[PDB]
């Protein structure tokens, strides 16, 4: 807890302009530090490149041993890291600890994924004795969001390091402290010098890193906007492997449910967990028009009003905490303000709970006939649309260029079956909230939610490239020569 | 038996573009005549492939597999006729064109196993419920085909794509349109629904109209790192369209400490001169240890290399290699080794034009040990040799290229190979076997300027299907322990 930078195993103040991380509700300063400058970034990259040569040579077993030690250190400091996350983001403790346990779980699963997606295989084939092994890329710049400053960046870092990569981690300028803590835990775990390198900063720092001509890969978790910016930047440079993980305008369907409070439960999970700040949250809820939906939305609004929202560490733990900043909340309020005047009516008003904080109350808005923008956004603002035929519901679900998550809450399996059949989305759930993905299976958005480099399990796919060999043992003539060959 | 028509939505139709023709590389006579697809022709192909996708993606995996297997039946059934088309239109000798066909046939079952492993259907019980994983096709994929293997490579994209439920708008090389039309007719006679594959002949203009078309959902490419980079630059900012690039390489072959001379000379000639050196995995640069051993080796290598025959694809006794794709290309190769010799290099074996205005080139070997030539890819039987001192200097040379397709070593000492694998950055790396003759059973993806990390061959299945993972439950109902702040 110092505010430094980290390069080649050494902690050093940044040469860039200082910035600070403020707590979303208290407003006081939680972090102070210097942002990485241009030459600072050149240093991080040069030293990760240097460390690569020695790190790529470590066996898979050794790299796994260091990473696992990192996991043991995660368990040992679970509460302190949880408290750091919740403190700096506004997420409640009970949820931050969830993010930590997720970081821990990302390890063994990343191991199995490495061994299946990019393992070592040996076989006898027609052209001789074929063998297949997987090689790391080199220096991968990892960008971290602010909603999960521990789970997601980790989900890039573990698979990459394990496979022999070296990392230049640039966290969000809204969650630098959690980043510094995680880096210290990699140090205290015995990670060779320069194998991971921390570069704090904001937009300028990320600019200097992304354009840097010596990175060998870039792994991104963040807004579809900046993700597309990066993808355009690398236009014409296929040599640098890019992984883009972006948002979505995720739809949730709830039709013909026999357990009301159950569907209200899973719905509230999907739309409001993490203050609606989980990238897999449902931003659009679809309910069959008429009487049945009226009953459902009645109960859903009833229970949603009952949700508590307070500081990350309130004596009785609330359901959700603050939004990252008071400004973000301001833009959300202006957002639903633009929705209402567009023609929508408020089923449940999104309210600012304390004077100049990011504490927002749940918000539900009906714009069934209205046409708002296809735009992603974090916050507890849920747009609801009422539909006639189910074949119309499927039309609505796909009514977005994003393609991350989508699912249906229903007792009828065939609604799910036809959903899976028709929907164009990354993860599509039935009777479980859109949130809470499984790291044991891929996690890759389609459309504007990724560039077809799915992470989580298939993370192992974009951390290592394949080397295939036809081994012989002795260069010697075939039984029957080809035409035109005389000896 | 051929026509020269385009093929869209199951219908054969003359193209609306300007006419062109496919010439035999040595005979000079016309082998194909047809109209290239125009802008609206391509818009039609794409629109109709998109329409057909909706119906094709819903077929089960088994049914699509059955149609493709029927395609295999037809490949075996017409093996010799398709071989003759390939050899005729490219100049490749018959005996190896027959190989290209057998490779097309083999690309099927392996594409199946690949689909079931890399993008299958799996189910497991996990913490968040009963999780399931299935793999979906992208949609309309534009497939561009080379000219060295107008059958094997395009197929290596098409089978994996069709099988996974994609539809294809195939644009073949304007140097091998006939092979394309014939192959398409073979897909027709195989029962492929209308619009699931759509042939769009043409040259640069046609391919541009296809790549720029705002309705493709993927682009699969095999061709020069030059045009490949052009395409990649084009899609800059469009991650929604999945792109796979398969590009060339400045492939190095090292031969040090071989106790069987004629064997290593064999594998060398295979790697550098097979198919007139027009296989993308050919060794463009041979590395031989400085001094006596390399002197003897290269001596033998030139002796035997001179003994190579080169003639028409249908020579009475089949030669080792045929003509290069065109006489003009050959012209640029001659200009190439001329620029190397005047650059400071010495000619170990002169590349000569065997007939006046043809693509018949004789093997060419050039020593440029001290000279610095361009890091550039090129097809042709022109082999540059580099002599090295320490083995770590040989490794220094191998990576002396921005391309990263193939590389291998001819040696009796396994540890030289081990140090190669450890250090070399290339897609496929062979030991004591020719650089040519890859294995469709294992991935095939070049690094650096040889691809964008969407390797084909076995891993083709990865860029033909995207993953959908689901947490199924059965009934939306409250958990045992609620979250804090939820009242009912
Ligand atoms: N796909 C996912 O799993 C996932 C996860 C989290 C968030 N999201 C999406 O992201 C939205 C919020 O954005 P966010 O804050 O998480 O990510 P972001 O846009 O802030 O990007 C992460 C970091 O990259 C750096 N950066 C900013 N500008 C840059 C630039 N121009 N060039 C290089 N680096 C730059 C900053 O550190 C920035 O905070 C969410 O509401 C949701 O839409 C998606
Ligand atoms: N990666 C591999 O496996 C592989 C395979 C074969 C050849 N190669 C290499 O590629 C080169 C030979 O390939 P080639 O000359 O057939 O490639 P190419 O550039 O001719 O590409 C094939 C076809 O694409 C079309 N085309 C041309 N310009 C286009 C454009 N601007 N936009 C869209 N389409 C366009 C034309 O039909 C062209 O002939 C050599 O470097 C060779 O070694 C690599």
Ligand 2, pocket residues at CB < 6 Å: B 144, 146-148, 153, 173-174, 203-204, 207-208, 211, 222-224, 227, 230, 246-248, 280, 377, 379
CB-CB contact of A165 with A135 (8 Å) = no
- Rounded to the nearest 5 degrees, what angle is found at the Cα of B478, between the Cα atoms of B477 and B484? 155
Q: SS3 string of B301-369?
A: HHHHHHCCCECCCCCCCCCCECCCCCHHHHHHHHHHHHHHHCCCCEEEECCCECCCCCCCECCEEEECC
User: Residues B100, B174, B246, B377: which is the catalytic one?
Assistant: B246
CB-CB contact of A423 with A397 (8 Å) = yes
* Residue A20: other Cβ atoms inside 10 A: 14
What is the C-alpha to C-alpha distance for residues A313 and B344, in angstroms, rounded to an integer?
A: 75
List the one residue out of B459, B427, B445, B448 whose CA is nearest residue B246.
B445
Helix (H, G, I), strand (E, B) or coil at A262: helix
Cβ-based neighbours of B217, under 8 Å, separated by 6 or more: B138, B139, B140, B141, B240, B241, B242
What residue segments make up the domains of chain B, in order of their start? 1-249+440-488, 250-439
- Rounded to the nearest 5 degrees, what angle is found at the Cα of A262, between the Cα atoms of A379 and B471? 75
What is the C-alpha to C-alpha distance for residues B223 and B149, in angstroms, rounded to an integer?
A: 11
Residue B451 is classified by DSSP as B
* Tokens representing residue B253 in the block: 């072959």
Q: Which ligand lies nearest the alpha carbon of B329?
A: 2
B246 catalytic? Reply is yes
Please judge whether B478 and A265 are an interchain contact, meaning their C-beta atoms are less than 8 angstroms apart.
Answer: yes
Question: Which residue, chain included where needed, has tokens 């220096």?
Answer: A139
Q: What is the end-to-end Cα distance of chain A in Å, rounded? A: 73
List the one residue out of B144, B92, B107, B108 whose CA is nearest residue B439.
B107
List the one residue out of A180, A199, A184, A196 whose CA is nearest residue A63.
A196
Compute the count of residue pairs across chains A and B with CB atoms less than 8 Å apart.
293
Query: CA dist A263 to A168, A288, B299, Å?
Result: 43, 14, 80
Residue A192 is classified by DSSP as P
What is the C-alpha to C-alpha distance for residues A224 and B378, in angstroms, rounded to an integer?
A: 39
Min Cα distance B36 → chain A (Å) is: 28
Exposed / middle / buried, residue A290 (Cβ in 10 Å: 0-12, 13-18, 19+): exposed
Which segments of B are annotated as binding site for NAD(+)? 223-228
Calculate Rg over the CA atoms of chain A: 24
CA A479 to chain centre: 56
Span from the CA of B242 to the centroid of ligand 1 (angstroms): 22
Q: Catalytic site residues of A?
A: 245, 279
User: Which run of H or of E encompasses B56?
Assistant: helix B39-56
* Residue B214: other Cβ atoms inside 10 A: 8
Please judge whether B229 and A241 are an interchain contact, meaning their C-beta atoms are less than 8 angstroms apart.
Answer: no
Angle at which helices B177-188 and B79-90 pack, to 10 degrees?
A: 160
CB-CB contact of A427 with B469 (8 Å) = yes
| Shortest-distance Cα residue to atom 29 of ligand 2 | B204
- Assigned architecture for domain B1-249+440-488: 3-Layer(aba) Sandwich (3.40)
Torsion sign over Cα B422, B424, B426, B429: negative
Give residue A436's region: left, alpha or beta (phi > 0; psi -120 to 50): left
Task: Specify whether domain B250-439 bears CATH 3.40.309.10.
Answer: yes
Residue B481 is classified by DSSP as S
Give the β-pairing of A128-136 and A121-125: antiparallel
What is the C-alpha to C-alpha distance for residues A67 and A69, in angstroms, rounded to an integer?
A: 5
- Rounded to the nearest 5 degrees, what angle is found at the Cα of B453, between the Cα atoms of B452 and B456? 105
Helix (H, G, I), strand (E, B) or coil at B246: strand
List the one residue out of B188, B120, B127, B179 whose CA is nearest residue B155.
B179
Q: Which residues of A113-124 are buried (b: 16+ CB within 10 A; e: fewer)?
A: bbeebbeeeeee
Span from the CA of B305 to the centroid of ligand 2 (angstroms): 28
Cβ-based neighbours of B242, under 8 Å, separated by 6 or more: A451, A452, B138, B141, B217, B218, B219, B454, B463, B466
What is the C-alpha to C-alpha distance for residues A117 and B458, in angstroms, rounded to an integer?
A: 13
* Residue B418: other Cβ atoms inside 10 A: 12
What is the C-alpha to C-alpha distance for residues A420 and A406, in angstroms, rounded to an integer?
A: 10
Give the β-pairing of A128-136 and A464-471: antiparallel
| Phi, psi values for residue A228, rounded to 5° | -65, -35
Span from the CA of B145 to the centroid of ligand 2 (angstroms): 7
Q: Which fold has domain A249-438?
A: Aldehyde Dehydrogenase; Chain A, domain 2 (3.40.309)
Residues of B in Cβ contact (< 8 Å) with A466: 427, 442-443, 445, 455, 459
Would you say how long chain B is, in residues? 488
List the one residue out of B252, B250, B290, B256 whose CA is nearest residue B410.
B256
Task: Specify whether domain A1-248+439-487 bears CATH 3.40.50.12240.
Answer: no
| Method of determination used here | X-ray
Cβ-based neighbours of B353, under 8 Å, separated by 6 or more: B330, B334, B360, B361, B362
Which segments of A are annotated as binding site for NAD(+)? 222-227
Residue A320 is classified by DSSP as B
Is the CB of residue B481 less than 8 Å away from at least one CB of chain A? no
What is the C-alpha to C-alpha distance for residues A124 and B439, in angstroms, rounded to an integer?
A: 11
């Amino acid at each position: 807890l110092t505010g430094n930078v980290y390069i080649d195993g050494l902690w050093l103040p940044g040469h860039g302009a200082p910035f600070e991380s403020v707590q979303p509700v208290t407003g006081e300063t939680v972090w102070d530090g210097n942002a990485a400058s241009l030459e600072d970034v050149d240093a991080a990259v040069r030293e990760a490149r240097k460390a690569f040569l020695a790190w790529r040579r470590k066996s898979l077993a050794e790299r796994q041993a260091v990473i696992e030690a990192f996991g043991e250190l995660l368990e040992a400091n679970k509460e302190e890291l949880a408290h750091q996350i919740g403190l700096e983001t506004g997420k409640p403790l009970w949820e931050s600890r969830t993010e930590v346990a997720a970081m821990m779980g990302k390890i063994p699963i990343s191991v199995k994924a490495y061994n299946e997606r990019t393992g070592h295989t040996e076989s006898d084939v027609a052209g001789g004795h074929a063998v297949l092994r997987h090689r790391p890329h080199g220096v991968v710049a990892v960008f971290g969001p602010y909603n999960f400053p521990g789970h997601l960046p980790n989900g890039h870092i573990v698979p990459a390091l394990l496979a022999g990569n070296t990392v230049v981690f640039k966290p969000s300028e809204l969650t630098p402290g959690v980043a510094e803590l995680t880096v210290r835990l990699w140090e205290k775990a015995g990670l060779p010098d320069g194998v991971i390198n921390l570069v704090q900063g904001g937009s300028d720092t990320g600019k200097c890193l992304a354009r840097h001509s010596l990175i060998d890969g870039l792994f991104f978790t963040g807004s579809s906007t900046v993700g597309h910016l990066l993808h355009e930047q690398f236009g014409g440079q296929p040599e640098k492997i890019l992984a883009l993980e972006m948002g979505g305008n995720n739809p949730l369907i709830v039709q013909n449910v026999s357990d009301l409070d159950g569907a209200v439960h899973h719905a509230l999970q999907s739309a409001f967990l993490s203050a609606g700040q989980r990238c897999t949250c449902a931003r659009r809820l679809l309910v069959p028009k008429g009487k049945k939906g009226d009953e459902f939305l009645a109960r859903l609004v009833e229970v949603a009003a009952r949700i508590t929202v307070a500081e990350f560490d309130a004596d009785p733990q609330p359901f959700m905490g603050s939004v990252i900043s008071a400004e973000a909340a301001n833009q959300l309020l202006k957002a639903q303000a633009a929705m209402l005047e567009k023609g929508a009516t408020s089923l449940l008003e999104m309210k600012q709970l304390k004077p100049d904080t990011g504490l927002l109350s749940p918000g539900i808005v009906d714009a069934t006939g209205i046409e708002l923008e296809d735009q992603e956004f974090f916050g507890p603002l849920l747009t609801v649309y009422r539909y006639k035929g189910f074949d119309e519901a499927l039309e609505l679900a796909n009514n977005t260029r994003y393609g991350l998550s989508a699912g249906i809450l229903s007792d009828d399996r065939k609604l799910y079956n036809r959903l899976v059949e028709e929907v164009r989305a990354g993860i599509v759930n039935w009777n479980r909230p859109l949130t809470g993905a499984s790291s044991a299976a891929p996690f890759g958005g389609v459309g504007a939610s990724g560039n077809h480099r799915p992470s989580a399990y298939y993370a192992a796919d974009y951390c290592a490239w394949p080397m295939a060999s036809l081994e012989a043992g002795k260069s010697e003539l075939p039984d029957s020569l080809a035409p035109g060959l005389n000896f």
